[PDB]
Amino acid sequence: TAKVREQEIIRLTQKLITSITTGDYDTYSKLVDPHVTCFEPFSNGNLVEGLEFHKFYFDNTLSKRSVPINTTILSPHVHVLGEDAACICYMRLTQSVNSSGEAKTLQQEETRVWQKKGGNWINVHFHISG
Amino acid sequence: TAKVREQEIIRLTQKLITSITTGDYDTYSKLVDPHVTCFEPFSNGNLVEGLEFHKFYFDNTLSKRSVPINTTILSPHVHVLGEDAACICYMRLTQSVNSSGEAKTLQQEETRVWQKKGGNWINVHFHISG
Amino acid sequence: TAKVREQEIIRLTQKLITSITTGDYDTYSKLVDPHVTCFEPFSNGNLVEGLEFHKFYFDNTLSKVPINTTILSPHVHVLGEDAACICYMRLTQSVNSSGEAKTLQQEETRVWQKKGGNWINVHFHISG
Amino acid sequence: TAKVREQEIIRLTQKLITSITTGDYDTYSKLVDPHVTCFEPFSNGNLVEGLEFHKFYFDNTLSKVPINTTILSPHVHVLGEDAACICYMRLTQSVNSSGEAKTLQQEETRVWQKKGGNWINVHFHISGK
Amino acid sequence: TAKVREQEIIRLTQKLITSITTGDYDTYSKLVDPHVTCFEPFSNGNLVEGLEFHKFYFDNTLSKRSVPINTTILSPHVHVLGEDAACICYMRLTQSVNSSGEAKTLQQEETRVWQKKGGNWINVHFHISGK
Amino acid sequence: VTAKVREQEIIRLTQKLITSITTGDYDTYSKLVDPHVTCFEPFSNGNLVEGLEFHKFYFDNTLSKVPINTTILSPHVHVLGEDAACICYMRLTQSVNSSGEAKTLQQEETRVWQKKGGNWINVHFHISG
Amino acid sequence: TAKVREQEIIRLTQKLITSITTGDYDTYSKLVDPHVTCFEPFSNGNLVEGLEFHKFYFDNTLSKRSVPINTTILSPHVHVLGEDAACICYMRLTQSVNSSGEAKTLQQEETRVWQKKGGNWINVHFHISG
Amino acid sequence: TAKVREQEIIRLTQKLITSITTGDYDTYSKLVDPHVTCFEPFSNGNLVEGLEFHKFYFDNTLSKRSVPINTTILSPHVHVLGEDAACICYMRLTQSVNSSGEAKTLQQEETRVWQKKGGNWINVHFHISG
Amino acid sequence: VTAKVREQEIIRLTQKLITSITTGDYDTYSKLVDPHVTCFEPFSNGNLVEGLEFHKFYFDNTLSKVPINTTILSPHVHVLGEDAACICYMRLTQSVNSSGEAKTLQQEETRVWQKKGGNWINVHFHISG
Amino acid sequence: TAKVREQEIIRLTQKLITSITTGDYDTYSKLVDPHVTCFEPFSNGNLVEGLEFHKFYFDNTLSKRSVPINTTILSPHVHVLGEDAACICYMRLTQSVNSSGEAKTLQQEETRVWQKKGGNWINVHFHISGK
Amino acid sequence: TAKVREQEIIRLTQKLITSITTGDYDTYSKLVDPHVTCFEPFSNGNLVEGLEFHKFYFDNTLSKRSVPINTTILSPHVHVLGEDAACICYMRLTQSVNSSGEAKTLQQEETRVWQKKGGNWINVHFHISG
Amino acid sequence: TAKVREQEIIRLTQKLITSITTGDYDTYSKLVDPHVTCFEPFSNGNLVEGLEFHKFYFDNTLSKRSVPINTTILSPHVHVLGEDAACICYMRLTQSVNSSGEAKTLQQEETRVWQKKGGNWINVHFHISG
Amino acid sequence: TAKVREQEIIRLTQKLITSITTGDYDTYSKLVDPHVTCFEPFSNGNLVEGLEFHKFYFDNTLSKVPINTTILSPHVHVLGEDAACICYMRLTQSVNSSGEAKTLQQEETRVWQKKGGNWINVHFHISGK
Amino acid sequence: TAKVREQEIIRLTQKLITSITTGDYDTYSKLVDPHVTCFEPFSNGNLVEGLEFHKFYFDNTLSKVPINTTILSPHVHVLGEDAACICYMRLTQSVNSSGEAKTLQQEETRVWQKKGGNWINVHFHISG
């Protein structure tokens, strides 16, 4: 059944997004490939490879956010590409409130490619824009 | 072997990008799934599905010229996911010249997911950011 | 039957939006109530009533450029036998006669009511 | 009577707005469906679903300045026994620490459905000019 | 019988608004008092008196308009002050299109005081804001 | 010319009314302004609002809480009948901030008065500026 | 009587403003003292003396008028100073329409001092601003 | 004689300007008519009547003066209108220094109409601008 | 008070000099202004320039090539001696562009006159504005 | 003997400029006529008369300055008009530093008319521009 | 002798710069390696490989410049790296004049790496900034 | 073989970049020629020679911290010119976080020419652009 | 005589400036060294050498508006028999098609060397404030 | 001897520039003429004469931040036995006490004259 496999990718992507917002680099480093490639706003239009580029935010910005946030995932589409591969597409809304009573919402679009290596799904590439 | 698979994906992508810049929707529609999903600047942050969104450009803008353009593909990385699936990521430079001989270069980052369906490689999803 | 009703409202809505982009006021005036209420950017923050406010655009704008519309994440609330709500985002691709493309996005709520066995749009809310 | 039901929906909407402006989430969460859908400025052009998106503001800003709300030009569409839609403009008067007055205007559409004998708000659309 | 009087004030105002949009000064000058007082955006914050201030627009602006427009009257409230006096207030939406073809909507808020002088309803004072 | 006294009564009530506004005296204001008054004013954001609640909000949060001086210019009074009158005038408000810098604000005001039960009540007004 | 003299000063002023708008320098030069002083925006904060400074606009602007206008005199206040002197204070609204068809309104504040010299009323000083 | 009256109007004006700068409202209220009219920048293009509008600045600004100033009266011109009336026109330079120590100069143009009422000279109208 | 006539002569020459400037009459100007005149003026960019060449350039390229009116205000004349005088005044120049829009420009001028050979010559001047 | 008279006017002007920069009003008031006419940037385009206009700066600005400054006189030209009259013109550079420590240079152009009244040279008129 | 080799690199760089300013792609294509790498302002911060990226300007902008120009080469430093390799560094000033009488100067800094392949010096990499 | 030579250059460059970010001038001065030439943003478009220009940063800015930074090297291409010379070209991404937890990414493009002098590889020239 | 040589250099500089402003390259190229060095705004902060950089302007803009040049505060440093340096400010008056006047100021240093008995300008530095 | 003279002027010039960056007015006042003329940005387009104009900066600025100077493309015109001109660009690296570096560039001409057997700077021109 494929609908079961769509649910696992969604489950894993939720798990991955939770690890980013809570600064839990240990879960992140187990779900994302050590040779992950990516495009994202901080990569300044370059394809960057490796976890260290992202570990830098877990060390300095994600683990040190005092602000409360709420994340919403919109329109999750999962392409089951085979028995060992999948692609998930979704928009991500982050609500936040700063030192004042001033709230803001930010939107990102994300593509994440999951691959089954060993018997484990690992995110081998992602593209983020917003 | 792996290298040949990477070359096949790079060829398909080269031919896919060729059809776009040429305005050759006949080749585009054979390479891109009819239920393709995608993120691109013109989707305004939304995941749009289907070919009609892109066909709009083949019939009204990609048909148009005579501006000369040269396209350069940079740093293409191909993930071979399985026998039936692959992902390619690359940057795209477009050189152009407007009226009065002023040259500009534009850069796009692209993720294309490829899937073998019926023995044929089809682009089931892509993600573009400026 | 829950999904049948959803598809029926999505059909009517597609039909309505086509009538807007075509400039086909005959179809629009048959699907939209003569006493429709609405919020839209041109109403300038006011609730306006009646088709005339909208007929103005069919007569002086919409009947005059290629475009393509996309309806995103349509959700239909089935409200009973004779009522439904549909809400969606709408992307309008267009060109400026100079060869440049633009995409505009609007958010739409439309309330459908079955009056005399016919589905009519009695209220809609459009924002950007 | 149509007059009677129109008034019921207006009173449900006043009760709901009061719960929003006072930070009373228990009342809000009983009037708004757990799977509510909505468009509002903070949804950034998206259709968002569920209470959590709104509960975020009850927990982090709403339970905090004097204000007065006015409901302008309310129109209630009665849609059968168990459904109604109401649309109106909402004027919010407020004063900052500086004692400076300020009026904000929003336009709202709220779809109400009677579920389990209770009137629940299943979708709302909020915008500003 | 007050709802009778209200529908008459509304009809007169509609007739008045129509004479403005169409540039029919003959109908305007029969409905508006020759010594009408008014506040409006073109009066620059001043209470102006007399028709001559307004006739200036019928003879220059309100005539030369060939642009299509549609007028909507919103939230009309009529205060029936007595047998010989009434007051009406409303918002007025004006849609229009460019020669380029782009549309815009303008909003004004209008108060109009009507007095029965002789046997006719005359607009003796009006107030307009919003630009 | 028996009506010249009738225009002095309106002027006196209007001055009494504006006095109530600038001193924060809601009790006098509520006696002079109809409970179902309609109005346009800059703080209504272009909308016709009804009732005293909209205006009581300023008496409770801004007007009772800096030195000011108010001038009424070119007051014209229209006598419409035995039970109805209309007055229109411009209002200059001078003020000074904390820093000691002077400021003058101008508003145009139309006020409609109606005799109800032998008492002149302000049933509609329109303010711009 | 007091009100007749007010009416006279107002009449002279209306006559003077009419001469200004229609470019009629013959009437202006009979009503305005040859050694008139004045403050006006074109005097750049200076008190200017003589008719020549004003004749300049009659010969180059006021008579080259190619635009329709209407003038309104607001809240005229006359100070009857003596037998042979008066002062009038008023605001002047000028409505006009540009070449395209767009209307505008300008406001000026004016003080005019009138003196009866040789049995004839002459404007000996005026002060204009916006 | 003509020059003695000019000297008198100038003297009254200097006396009046001194009362303005030192916040001396007792002298101001004896020299300025209780029904004085005026145009000045704080009247927002309106002709305002009465002393109360001006008393406001004596009680809240002119008497709260905490800055040194010097006033110069430039090119005073007196029109002797009759026995009981005069008009004076002049420019007023006000030098001052801010809290830090930076000097500035402001210019105003003033017309003042004086009337002899009950044998005493009273300023019945004035027009100020910049 | 024999010197009051001496100040009228300076005034007459100055008016004659400014007349020569506005009419483009270099011949009169060159007779009234010293051949080794020194000056500050806005077109000298803050520098002291010497000689007539700098100013002849305007007579040849701008002043002889639009209607204008010139007003001289508050002319003060200083009589320094039998052979020397100084005059200072403000100058208002009104003009109108092609479009018909009016314009007024202000300049402050000091002019130093010296009797050389029984003839008053302008040996230094200073213009600002 | 004219070059003699020029060096004296230059010395007087240097004495005058020094009394300005140092805020010594006693020396200023002995060199500047009590009815001195002047044009300067603080006069806002007007010819002002009398010392009182300038004494205002000696008593507020030209005193309270503790900033270091250096003054340079450039291109001084002296017109010797006669025995009792002379004119001098020059550019004046003023350097100065902030409390922050940043330097700036300002330039003014100055004309000064000197008259021998009695047996003393008095500055009867001056013109300053450039700001 | 090395000073002779410095002169050949300078001679070749002059020859190369002449071919760019005159639009002579044929000389350019013989002096620059078909697998040349480069950084330059139009590469938008990317390393681009190949001649086609540059051929695009010869076809569209360099061969179609009507404007006259003068080139000046400042501070040419030549590093002789070996018998088959050299590096030359210099600043390049381009004077030009547009349709009007308006002249302008632009400055670029250039590094060019020359390699001896066969018996011919070819430019195998260049970096341009400005 | 070729690959080892490319690895040696990439190692030297890695060690060179390490010394810069660390502030370790002792290692920098051993890798960079004493007569090194260079173009960089801080040279304001000029070719500067010698180490003292760069030593200024080791003693006054690279010594400073405690801002965390991560550096990423992208697309390194190494030209092996001969036995005694090589050229490496790459892009450099620097992630950083200022006070208040705001992250920024900066990109630089770099050309470094390497020469074997006395059996030791020395960076004789480099070219940096932002 | 020092006065005599100072005058020679000033006249060489007037001749050179005249050749620049009239477009007379034959005269310029005989007064300016073929290996001249220079700083000027168009050199963009660089020391440029040779005539070609300047000949570019003779061929493409200079041979084209009335102008008057003034040399201000010339100072000549006599540096032995065969060398001198002169520094001065140059004011250029000009008029555009619109008949609008305009003054530009440059500061210049020119080093003159007697080579082959002829005075040649071997280096110049030009700036503007 | 042509190059010896060039190196002598480059030595003196380096020595002069060090005296500026050090705030060492004693050395500066020995290498620069008491009647030096100059153009520099602070002279505001004027030719100024004398050391006092420059002493102002030694007393209120230069004697108060780390910096490094670089002299670029120095060219010396040997003008005779007793005169030379040197022109060069000058880069001044500095920090703002907040940790940020800046580079400023100036273009300098300096005229050296041998008076009494000693080289003195009689004129200099500085622009940016």
Residue numbers in the entry:
A (entry chain G), B (entry chain D), G (entry chain B), H (entry chain B), K (entry chain G), L (entry chain D): 342 to 471
C (entry chain C), N (entry chain C): 342 to 405, 408 to 471
D (entry chain A), M (entry chain A): 342 to 405, 408 to 472
E (entry chain E), J (entry chain E): 342 to 472
F (entry chain F), I (entry chain F): 341 to 405, 408 to 471
What does the literature reporting this entry say, word for word?
Ca2+/calmodulin-dependent protein kinase II (CaMKII) is a Ser/Thr kinase that is particularly important in neuronal signaling and cardiac function. CaMKII has a unique architecture, in which the catalytic domains are linked flexibly to a hub domain, also called the association domain, which forms a dodecameric or tetradecameric assembly. We reported recently that the activation of CaMKII-α by ATP and Ca2+/CaM triggers the exchange of activated subunits between different holoenzyme assemblies. Our data are consistent with the idea that the CaM-binding element induces the hub to transition from a closed-ring form to a ring-opened lock-washer configuration, which can release or capture dimer units.
The role of peptide docking in destabilizing the hub emerged from structures of the hubs of two CaMKII isoforms, denoted CaMKII-A and CaMKII-B, present in the sea anemone Nematostella vectensis. N. vectensis, a member of the phylum Cnidaria, is an early branching metazoan. The sequence identity between the hub domains in the two N. vectensis CaMKII isoforms is 62%, and these are 55% and 53% identical to the hub domain of human CaMKII-α respectively. The hub domain of CaMKII-A crystallized at pH 7, while that of CaMKII-B crystallized at pH 4.2. To illustrate this distortion from planarity, we aligned the pH 4.2 N. vectensis CaMKII-B hub structure onto the pH 7.0 CaMKII-A hub structure by superimposing the four subunits that are furthest from the break (E, F, G, and H). We then illustrate the deviation between the two structures with arrows that indicate the displacement of Cα atoms from the flat closed-ring structure (pH 7.0) to the slightly spiral, ring-opened, structure (pH 4.2; the lengths of the arrows are scaled by a factor of 2 for clarity).
